[PDB]
């Protein structure tokens, strides 16, 4: 273990509680001490990882199982079709364009010819006439994006260059004269950019100098008449809704804004699904934690009427207007999708298609499209694009494209959903994937995955590496739908955030206890994983019950819950986490904050034989979202408290960081994490 | 737009 300096004079007073921050100096990523820290950790990691002799066999199996063609869900503009393509091992997917669903495709933009395919396409937008394609190119490693515009007819670029963009989409007016987008100043703004002009000429539509932390999404109605600005605070599921009637502008957008402020508060989420003239249909969580559809006339905006009411059980996840006058409602019922077809006008049920364990998503049909396309993936289904022609065969889901994994028989394996009790009684859904007919004799290595926050729903999607775990390591995989997610609506999210964040860790721990008890595995043969907020998850559980885990892998997680809010965009995470500038909130945080809760378990009575599991902390050296200081400080603390502070520590399990989104880069991370896992669980290859 | 289901 490399020596790491401790600044013993850094202490802070949080409402009378003293907290030392020995590793405060690691909060600066450009000091040479800090770079040296990285290099020394990298030397240790690599040293350890050579010992992990299955890394090379994982790498090739992942590579072999990923090497298959993948057509993405096609979308239509005018009479052209557009979709993403990857022949199997390309670094980034490729945007392609076609005249007909099964005619010759044409490459439209290929990110692999730029910076080695370091980054792929994040913003992409085709105009209504299909003649223009506005896409987002990254400059360096940084969050920032430049918007350029290609002509689809001949793939020539417009001179137009829009800087200072991040997550904004390009939303085209139906006149094909330009698009709305949402940049930051050289305080996000809503702007309109006329094709063929300089960014300096772009029309300002909205800014709020008084509320700089508010950020924006926007949309344009399927008829082209209304531009909708959404305004959000933090990561709450809640937003404003302003509307601008573009037909009532006397000189188009060149005039200039006078928004009809339909919803001017953050009480509820609102998404627009459809409109007939001024009569709008929204999806909302207003008085309906599991969501519902409502209808309101903008010319009488006070009167809201339910159109499809809130289900007593199921989350209404999204909704789409299709085929002139229908709705497809995507429900999540016990973390399983259910698609309903309904009449747009009456909200009456017409058809109800349950879906197998797995996930459907990417429904991009628009109101005038009569053919709907969506993608289905599962643990043992690599990816199916289904098509439903609502006109001519509304009932049958026909297969449009079908990915096949080479040399993999899915009939060897199975997937079940079972429900397990948590500390406070609550039932927790979990997904267990493994080989058919196995004995529940406690012998199998086991990998458990979870997230636990921000209303994110964890779906059992396809991972190739996971097949390799199942087949070539005789493994059992568990995806755990703990609270803090949005799987059971807003009450599910609220029962695992702020003052109740602890429940999330308790839910995960219980899922592990279930798998130990039912004979799937045993303590010390369990591996946990999770990224970002699920790195926080992993870190917290191994502090509280290190006895349960053989291995642990936290990817760019949030570890200093006292100071997370001070860095890059961490301030938008205070809705979920609390903020340590408030006593009540400080007190939630201090109890579970990873870097402040590393204690030697062998010093606890009746617990002398317990050590932290083998831990890999995966992180970049320069991450713009979850600043790596988090991971470094945790690494620093663990290594200190459990290894370097003692002469001959019981902590034999290694504590390392792996230090680095392109395909082969991604396979390397995953093959490493899996080999490390194999060595930690003492598990042989099959 | 993930590049591969790894
Ligand atoms: C991962 O878990 C990290 C740590 C906690 C939340 N989080 C995020 O990835 C953030 C918050 C939820 C998803 N997310 C994000 O993409 O927000 C960034 C952003 C959105 C809108 C405007 C500006 C920035
Ligand atoms: Ca072990």
CSV table of N, CA, C and O in Angstrom, one decimal, chain A residues 445-539:
chain,number,residue,atom,x,y,z
A,445,UNK,N,-21.3,-18.6,-6.4
A,445,UNK,CA,-21.0,-17.2,-6.3
A,445,UNK,C,-22.2,-16.4,-6.7
A,445,UNK,O,-23.0,-16.9,-7.5
A,446,UNK,N,-22.3,-15.2,-6.2
A,446,UNK,CA,-23.5,-14.4,-6.4
A,446,UNK,C,-23.2,-12.9,-6.6
A,446,UNK,O,-22.5,-12.4,-5.8
A,447,UNK,N,-23.8,-12.3,-7.6
A,447,UNK,CA,-23.6,-10.9,-7.9
A,447,UNK,C,-24.9,-10.2,-7.8
A,447,UNK,O,-25.8,-10.5,-8.5
A,448,UNK,N,-24.9,-9.2,-6.9
A,448,UNK,CA,-26.1,-8.4,-6.6
A,448,UNK,C,-25.9,-7.0,-7.1
A,448,UNK,O,-24.9,-6.4,-6.9
A,449,UNK,N,-26.9,-6.5,-7.7
A,449,UNK,CA,-26.8,-5.1,-8.3
A,449,UNK,C,-28.1,-4.3,-7.9
A,449,UNK,O,-29.2,-4.9,-7.9
A,450,UNK,N,-27.8,-3.0,-7.6
A,450,UNK,CA,-28.9,-2.1,-7.2
A,450,UNK,C,-28.5,-0.7,-7.4
A,450,UNK,O,-27.3,-0.4,-7.7
A,451,UNK,N,-29.4,0.3,-7.3
A,451,UNK,CA,-29.1,1.7,-7.4
A,451,UNK,C,-29.7,2.5,-6.2
A,451,UNK,O,-28.8,2.9,-5.4
A,452,UNK,N,-31.0,2.7,-6.1
A,452,UNK,CA,-31.7,3.1,-4.9
A,452,UNK,C,-31.8,4.6,-4.7
A,452,UNK,O,-31.5,5.2,-3.6
A,453,UNK,N,-32.4,5.3,-5.7
A,453,UNK,CA,-32.6,6.8,-5.6
A,453,UNK,C,-33.2,7.5,-6.9
A,453,UNK,O,-33.3,6.9,-7.9
A,454,UNK,N,-33.6,8.7,-6.7
A,454,UNK,CA,-33.8,9.6,-7.8
A,454,UNK,C,-34.9,9.1,-8.8
A,454,UNK,O,-34.9,9.4,-10.0
A,455,UNK,N,-35.8,8.3,-8.2
A,455,UNK,CA,-36.9,7.8,-9.0
A,455,UNK,C,-36.5,6.9,-10.2
A,455,UNK,O,-37.3,6.6,-11.1
A,456,UNK,N,-35.2,6.4,-10.2
A,456,UNK,CA,-34.8,5.5,-11.3
A,456,UNK,C,-35.4,4.1,-11.2
A,456,UNK,O,-35.3,3.6,-10.1
A,457,UNK,N,-35.9,3.6,-12.2
A,457,UNK,CA,-36.4,2.3,-12.2
A,457,UNK,C,-35.3,1.3,-12.8
A,457,UNK,O,-34.8,1.5,-13.9
A,458,UNK,N,-34.9,0.3,-12.0
A,458,UNK,CA,-33.9,-0.7,-12.5
A,458,UNK,C,-34.6,-1.8,-13.2
A,458,UNK,O,-35.4,-2.6,-12.6
A,459,UNK,N,-34.4,-2.0,-14.5
A,459,UNK,CA,-35.0,-3.0,-15.3
A,459,UNK,C,-34.0,-4.1,-15.6
A,459,UNK,O,-32.8,-3.9,-15.8
A,460,UNK,N,-34.5,-5.4,-15.6
A,460,UNK,CA,-33.6,-6.5,-16.0
A,460,UNK,C,-33.3,-6.5,-17.5
A,460,UNK,O,-33.9,-7.3,-18.2
A,461,UNK,N,-32.3,-5.7,-17.9
A,461,UNK,CA,-31.9,-5.6,-19.3
A,461,UNK,C,-30.8,-6.6,-19.7
A,461,UNK,O,-30.4,-7.4,-18.8
A,462,UNK,N,-30.3,-6.5,-20.9
A,462,UNK,CA,-29.3,-7.5,-21.3
A,462,UNK,C,-27.9,-6.9,-21.1
A,462,UNK,O,-27.6,-5.9,-21.5
A,463,UNK,N,-27.2,-7.8,-20.4
A,463,UNK,CA,-25.7,-7.6,-20.3
A,463,UNK,C,-25.1,-8.9,-20.7
A,463,UNK,O,-25.4,-9.9,-20.2
A,464,UNK,N,-24.1,-8.7,-21.7
A,464,UNK,CA,-23.4,-9.9,-22.2
A,464,UNK,C,-22.4,-10.4,-21.1
A,464,UNK,O,-22.4,-11.6,-20.8
A,465,UNK,N,-21.7,-9.5,-20.4
A,465,UNK,CA,-20.8,-9.9,-19.4
A,465,UNK,C,-21.5,-10.8,-18.3
A,465,UNK,O,-20.9,-11.7,-17.7
A,466,UNK,N,-22.8,-10.5,-18.1
A,466,UNK,CA,-23.6,-11.2,-17.1
A,466,UNK,C,-23.9,-12.6,-17.5
A,466,UNK,O,-23.9,-13.5,-16.7
A,467,UNK,N,-24.1,-12.9,-18.8
A,467,UNK,CA,-24.1,-14.2,-19.4
A,467,UNK,C,-22.9,-15.0,-19.0
A,467,UNK,O,-22.9,-16.1,-18.7
A,468,UNK,N,-21.7,-14.3,-19.1
A,468,UNK,CA,-20.4,-14.9,-18.9
A,468,UNK,C,-20.3,-15.3,-17.5
A,468,UNK,O,-19.8,-16.4,-17.1
A,469,UNK,N,-20.7,-14.4,-16.6
A,469,UNK,CA,-20.8,-14.7,-15.2
A,469,UNK,C,-21.7,-15.9,-14.9
A,469,UNK,O,-21.3,-16.8,-14.2
A,470,UNK,N,-22.9,-16.0,-15.6
A,470,UNK,CA,-23.8,-17.1,-15.4
A,470,UNK,C,-23.3,-18.4,-15.9
A,470,UNK,O,-23.4,-19.5,-15.3
A,471,UNK,N,-22.7,-18.4,-17.1
A,471,UNK,CA,-22.3,-19.6,-17.8
A,471,UNK,C,-20.9,-20.1,-17.3
A,471,UNK,O,-20.7,-21.2,-16.9
A,472,UNK,N,-19.9,-19.2,-17.4
A,472,UNK,CA,-18.5,-19.5,-17.2
A,472,UNK,C,-18.0,-19.3,-15.8
A,472,UNK,O,-16.8,-19.5,-15.5
A,473,UNK,N,-18.8,-18.9,-14.9
A,473,UNK,CA,-18.5,-18.8,-13.5
A,473,UNK,C,-19.6,-19.5,-12.6
A,473,UNK,O,-19.6,-19.4,-11.3
A,474,UNK,N,-20.6,-20.2,-13.2
A,474,UNK,CA,-21.6,-20.9,-12.5
A,474,UNK,C,-22.3,-20.0,-11.5
A,474,UNK,O,-22.8,-20.4,-10.4
A,475,UNK,N,-22.5,-18.7,-11.9
A,475,UNK,CA,-22.9,-17.7,-11.1
A,475,UNK,C,-24.4,-17.5,-11.0
A,475,UNK,O,-25.2,-18.0,-11.9
A,476,UNK,N,-24.9,-16.8,-10.0
A,476,UNK,CA,-26.3,-16.4,-9.8
A,476,UNK,C,-26.3,-14.9,-9.8
A,476,UNK,O,-25.6,-14.3,-9.0
A,477,UNK,N,-27.2,-14.3,-10.6
A,477,UNK,CA,-27.2,-12.8,-10.6
A,477,UNK,C,-28.5,-12.3,-10.0
A,477,UNK,O,-29.6,-12.9,-10.3
A,478,UNK,N,-28.4,-11.3,-9.2
A,478,UNK,CA,-29.6,-10.7,-8.6
A,478,UNK,C,-29.7,-9.2,-8.9
A,478,UNK,O,-28.8,-8.4,-8.5
A,479,UNK,N,-30.7,-8.7,-9.6
A,479,UNK,CA,-31.0,-7.3,-9.6
A,479,UNK,C,-32.1,-7.0,-8.6
A,479,UNK,O,-33.2,-7.5,-8.6
A,480,UNK,N,-31.8,-6.0,-7.7
A,480,UNK,CA,-32.6,-5.7,-6.6
A,480,UNK,C,-33.3,-4.3,-6.7
A,480,UNK,O,-32.7,-3.2,-6.8
A,481,UNK,N,-34.7,-4.3,-6.7
A,481,UNK,CA,-35.5,-3.1,-6.8
A,481,UNK,C,-35.8,-2.6,-5.5
A,481,UNK,O,-37.0,-2.7,-5.0
A,482,UNK,N,-34.8,-2.0,-4.9
A,482,UNK,CA,-35.0,-1.4,-3.5
A,482,UNK,C,-35.7,0.0,-3.7
A,482,UNK,O,-35.9,0.5,-4.7
A,483,UNK,N,-36.1,0.5,-2.5
A,483,UNK,CA,-36.8,1.8,-2.4
A,483,UNK,C,-35.8,2.9,-2.8
A,483,UNK,O,-34.6,2.7,-2.9
A,484,UNK,N,-36.4,4.1,-3.0
A,484,UNK,CA,-35.6,5.2,-3.6
A,484,UNK,C,-35.7,5.3,-5.1
A,484,UNK,O,-35.6,6.3,-5.7
A,485,UNK,N,-36.0,4.1,-5.7
A,485,UNK,CA,-36.3,4.0,-7.1
A,485,UNK,C,-37.7,4.5,-7.3
A,485,UNK,O,-38.3,5.0,-6.4
A,486,UNK,N,-38.2,4.5,-8.5
A,486,UNK,CA,-39.5,5.0,-8.8
A,486,UNK,C,-40.5,3.9,-9.2
A,486,UNK,O,-41.5,4.2,-9.8
A,487,UNK,N,-40.1,2.6,-8.9
A,487,UNK,CA,-40.8,1.4,-9.5
A,487,UNK,C,-42.2,1.3,-9.0
A,487,UNK,O,-43.1,0.9,-9.8
A,488,UNK,N,-42.5,1.7,-7.8
A,488,UNK,CA,-43.9,1.7,-7.3
A,488,UNK,C,-44.4,3.2,-7.1
A,488,UNK,O,-45.1,3.4,-6.1
A,489,UNK,N,-44.0,4.1,-7.9
A,489,UNK,CA,-44.4,5.5,-7.8
A,489,UNK,C,-43.7,6.3,-6.8
A,489,UNK,O,-42.7,5.8,-6.2
A,490,UNK,N,-44.2,7.5,-6.6
A,490,UNK,CA,-43.5,8.5,-5.8
A,490,UNK,C,-43.3,8.2,-4.3
A,490,UNK,O,-42.4,8.6,-3.7
A,491,UNK,N,-44.2,7.3,-3.8
A,491,UNK,CA,-44.1,6.9,-2.4
A,491,UNK,C,-42.9,5.9,-2.3
A,491,UNK,O,-42.3,5.8,-1.2
A,492,UNK,N,-42.6,5.2,-3.3
A,492,UNK,CA,-41.5,4.3,-3.3
A,492,UNK,C,-40.2,5.1,-3.3
A,492,UNK,O,-39.2,4.7,-2.6
A,493,UNK,N,-40.2,6.2,-4.0
A,493,UNK,CA,-39.0,7.1,-4.1
A,493,UNK,C,-38.8,7.8,-2.7
A,493,UNK,O,-37.7,7.9,-2.2
A,494,UNK,N,-40.0,8.3,-2.1
A,494,UNK,CA,-39.9,9.1,-0.9
A,494,UNK,C,-39.5,8.2,0.4
A,494,UNK,O,-39.0,8.8,1.3
A,495,UNK,N,-39.8,6.9,0.3
A,495,UNK,CA,-39.5,6.0,1.4
A,495,UNK,C,-38.0,5.6,1.4
A,495,UNK,O,-37.6,4.7,2.2
A,496,UNK,N,-37.2,6.1,0.4
A,496,UNK,CA,-35.8,5.8,0.4
A,496,UNK,C,-35.0,7.1,0.0
A,496,UNK,O,-33.9,7.0,-0.6
A,497,UNK,N,-35.4,8.2,0.5
A,497,UNK,CA,-34.6,9.4,0.3
A,497,UNK,C,-34.7,10.3,1.5
A,497,UNK,O,-35.3,10.0,2.5
A,498,UNK,N,-33.8,11.4,1.5
A,498,UNK,CA,-33.7,12.3,2.5
A,498,UNK,C,-33.5,11.7,3.9
A,498,UNK,O,-32.5,11.0,4.1
A,499,UNK,N,-34.5,11.8,4.8
A,499,UNK,CA,-34.5,11.2,6.1
A,499,UNK,C,-34.6,9.6,6.1
A,499,UNK,O,-34.3,9.0,7.1
A,500,UNK,N,-35.1,9.1,5.0
A,500,UNK,CA,-35.3,7.6,4.9
A,500,UNK,C,-34.3,7.0,3.9
A,500,UNK,O,-34.5,5.8,3.5
A,501,UNK,N,-33.2,7.6,3.6
A,501,UNK,CA,-32.2,7.0,2.8
A,501,UNK,C,-31.7,5.6,3.4
A,501,UNK,O,-31.5,4.7,2.6
A,502,UNK,N,-31.6,5.6,4.7
A,502,UNK,CA,-31.2,4.3,5.3
A,502,UNK,C,-32.0,3.1,4.8
A,502,UNK,O,-31.4,2.0,4.7
A,503,UNK,N,-33.3,3.2,4.6
A,503,UNK,CA,-34.1,2.1,4.2
A,503,UNK,C,-33.6,1.5,2.9
A,503,UNK,O,-33.7,0.2,2.7
A,504,UNK,N,-33.1,2.3,2.0
A,504,UNK,CA,-32.5,1.7,0.8
A,504,UNK,C,-31.4,0.7,1.1
A,504,UNK,O,-31.4,-0.4,0.5
A,505,UNK,N,-30.5,1.0,2.0
A,505,UNK,CA,-29.4,0.1,2.4
A,505,UNK,C,-29.9,-1.1,3.0
A,505,UNK,O,-29.5,-2.2,2.7
A,506,UNK,N,-30.8,-0.9,3.9
A,506,UNK,CA,-31.6,-2.0,4.6
A,506,UNK,C,-32.3,-3.0,3.6
A,506,UNK,O,-32.3,-4.2,3.8
A,507,UNK,N,-32.9,-2.4,2.6
A,507,UNK,CA,-33.5,-3.2,1.5
A,507,UNK,C,-32.5,-4.1,0.8
A,507,UNK,O,-32.8,-5.3,0.5
A,508,UNK,N,-31.4,-3.5,0.4
A,508,UNK,CA,-30.3,-4.3,-0.3
A,508,UNK,C,-29.7,-5.4,0.6
A,508,UNK,O,-29.7,-6.6,0.3
A,509,UNK,N,-29.4,-5.0,1.9
A,509,UNK,CA,-28.9,-6.0,2.8
A,509,UNK,C,-29.9,-7.1,3.0
A,509,UNK,O,-29.4,-8.3,3.0
A,510,UNK,N,-31.2,-6.8,3.0
A,510,UNK,CA,-32.2,-7.9,3.2
A,510,UNK,C,-32.2,-8.9,2.0
A,510,UNK,O,-32.3,-10.1,2.2
A,511,UNK,N,-32.1,-8.3,0.8
A,511,UNK,CA,-32.0,-9.1,-0.4
A,511,UNK,C,-30.8,-10.1,-0.4
A,511,UNK,O,-30.9,-11.2,-0.8
A,512,UNK,N,-29.7,-9.6,0.2
A,512,UNK,CA,-28.5,-10.5,0.4
A,512,UNK,C,-28.8,-11.6,1.4
A,512,UNK,O,-28.6,-12.8,1.2
A,513,UNK,N,-29.5,-11.2,2.5
A,513,UNK,CA,-29.9,-12.1,3.6
A,513,UNK,C,-30.8,-13.2,3.0
A,513,UNK,O,-30.7,-14.4,3.3
A,514,UNK,N,-31.7,-12.7,2.1
A,514,UNK,CA,-32.6,-13.7,1.5
A,514,UNK,C,-31.8,-14.7,0.7
A,514,UNK,O,-32.1,-15.9,0.8
A,515,UNK,N,-30.9,-14.3,-0.1
A,515,UNK,CA,-30.1,-15.2,-1.0
A,515,UNK,C,-29.2,-16.2,-0.2
A,515,UNK,O,-29.0,-17.3,-0.6
A,516,UNK,N,-28.7,-15.7,0.9
A,516,UNK,CA,-27.9,-16.5,1.8
A,516,UNK,C,-29.0,-17.6,2.3
A,516,UNK,O,-28.7,-18.8,2.2
A,517,UNK,N,-30.1,-17.2,2.9
A,517,UNK,CA,-31.0,-18.1,3.6
A,517,UNK,C,-31.7,-19.1,2.7
A,517,UNK,O,-31.9,-20.3,3.1
A,518,UNK,N,-32.0,-18.8,1.4
A,518,UNK,CA,-32.7,-19.7,0.6
A,518,UNK,C,-31.8,-20.7,-0.1
A,518,UNK,O,-32.3,-21.6,-0.8
A,519,UNK,N,-30.5,-20.6,0.1
A,519,UNK,CA,-29.5,-21.6,-0.4
A,519,UNK,C,-28.9,-21.3,-1.7
A,519,UNK,O,-28.1,-22.0,-2.2
A,520,UNK,N,-29.2,-20.1,-2.2
A,520,UNK,CA,-28.5,-19.6,-3.5
A,520,UNK,C,-27.0,-19.4,-3.3
A,520,UNK,O,-26.2,-19.6,-4.2
A,521,UNK,N,-26.6,-19.1,-2.1
A,521,UNK,CA,-25.2,-18.7,-1.8
A,521,UNK,C,-24.9,-18.6,-0.4
A,521,UNK,O,-25.7,-19.1,0.5
A,522,UNK,N,-23.8,-18.0,0.0
A,522,UNK,CA,-23.5,-17.7,1.4
A,522,UNK,C,-22.7,-16.4,1.6
A,522,UNK,O,-22.1,-15.9,0.7
A,523,UNK,N,-22.6,-16.0,2.9
A,523,UNK,CA,-21.9,-14.8,3.2
A,523,UNK,C,-20.5,-14.9,2.6
A,523,UNK,O,-20.0,-16.1,2.6
A,524,UNK,N,-19.9,-13.9,2.2
A,524,UNK,CA,-18.5,-13.9,1.8
A,524,UNK,C,-18.3,-14.5,0.4
A,524,UNK,O,-17.2,-14.5,-0.2
A,525,UNK,N,-19.4,-15.0,-0.2
A,525,UNK,CA,-19.5,-15.4,-1.6
A,525,UNK,C,-20.4,-14.5,-2.4
A,525,UNK,O,-20.7,-14.8,-3.6
A,526,UNK,N,-20.8,-13.4,-1.8
A,526,UNK,CA,-21.7,-12.4,-2.4
A,526,UNK,C,-20.9,-11.2,-2.9
A,526,UNK,O,-20.1,-10.7,-2.2
A,527,UNK,N,-21.2,-10.8,-4.1
A,527,UNK,CA,-20.6,-9.6,-4.7
A,527,UNK,C,-21.7,-8.6,-4.9
A,527,UNK,O,-22.7,-8.9,-5.6
A,528,UNK,N,-21.4,-7.3,-4.5
A,528,UNK,CA,-22.4,-6.3,-4.8
A,528,UNK,C,-21.7,-5.3,-5.7
A,528,UNK,O,-20.5,-5.1,-5.8
A,529,UNK,N,-22.6,-4.6,-6.5
A,529,UNK,CA,-22.1,-3.6,-7.5
A,529,UNK,C,-23.2,-2.5,-7.7
A,529,UNK,O,-24.4,-2.8,-7.3
A,530,UNK,N,-22.8,-1.4,-8.2
A,530,UNK,CA,-23.7,-0.2,-8.4
A,530,UNK,C,-22.8,1.0,-8.7
A,530,UNK,O,-21.7,1.1,-8.3
A,531,UNK,N,-23.4,1.9,-9.5
A,531,UNK,CA,-22.7,3.0,-10.0
A,531,UNK,C,-23.3,4.3,-9.6
A,531,UNK,O,-24.5,4.4,-9.4
A,532,UNK,N,-22.5,5.4,-9.5
A,532,UNK,CA,-23.0,6.7,-9.1
A,532,UNK,C,-23.7,6.6,-7.7
A,532,UNK,O,-23.1,6.3,-6.7
A,533,UNK,N,-25.0,6.9,-7.7
A,533,UNK,CA,-25.8,6.7,-6.4
A,533,UNK,C,-25.8,5.2,-5.9
A,533,UNK,O,-26.1,5.0,-4.7
A,534,UNK,N,-25.5,4.3,-6.8
A,534,UNK,CA,-25.4,2.9,-6.4
A,534,UNK,C,-24.0,2.5,-6.0
A,534,UNK,O,-23.7,1.4,-5.6
A,535,UNK,N,-23.1,3.5,-6.1
A,535,UNK,CA,-21.7,3.3,-5.5
A,535,UNK,C,-21.8,3.7,-4.1
A,535,UNK,O,-21.3,3.0,-3.2
A,536,UNK,N,-22.5,4.8,-3.8
A,536,UNK,CA,-23.0,5.2,-2.5
A,536,UNK,C,-23.6,4.0,-1.8
A,536,UNK,O,-23.3,3.7,-0.6
A,537,UNK,N,-24.6,3.3,-2.5
A,537,UNK,CA,-25.2,2.1,-2.0
A,537,UNK,C,-24.2,1.1,-1.5
A,537,UNK,O,-24.3,0.5,-0.4
A,538,UNK,N,-23.3,0.7,-2.4
A,538,UNK,CA,-22.3,-0.3,-2.1
A,538,UNK,C,-21.5,0.0,-0.9
A,538,UNK,O,-21.3,-0.8,0.0
A,539,UNK,N,-21.0,1.3,-1.0
A,539,UNK,CA,-20.1,1.7,0.1
A,539,UNK,C,-20.7,1.7,1.4
A,539,UNK,O,-20.1,1.3,2.4
